[PDB]
């Protein structure tokens, strides 16, 4: 974490800095988006 890292979250290729979320997700939510159609937060498939 806290570094510019190429990530691949269940087939989602991207490039960014992975920091802590600090927002309450409901337990049925996998993705997280913004005003545009870009993924802003992904739930981890292993450590949840």
């Amino acid at each position: 974490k806290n570094k510019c890292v190429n990530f691949n979250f269940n087939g989602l290729k991207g490039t960014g800095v992975l920091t802590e979320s600090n927002k309450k997700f409901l337990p049925f939510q996998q993705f997280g988006r913004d005003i545009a159609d870009t993924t802003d937060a992904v739930r981890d498939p292993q450590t949840l």
Binding site: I35, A36, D37, T38
Partner: protein
Amino acid sequence: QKLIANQFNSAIGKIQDSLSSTASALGKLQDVVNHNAQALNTLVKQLS
């Protein structure tokens, strides 16, 4: 001279109370910010 000075002070003192009311006195300066914000949010929303 005292009447002119008193009327000038009464006209200057009513400027702040007129600008603190009617909710659209500074709308010409709010429009140039609300147009740029709308033109930027349109560029954000056209990526979806």
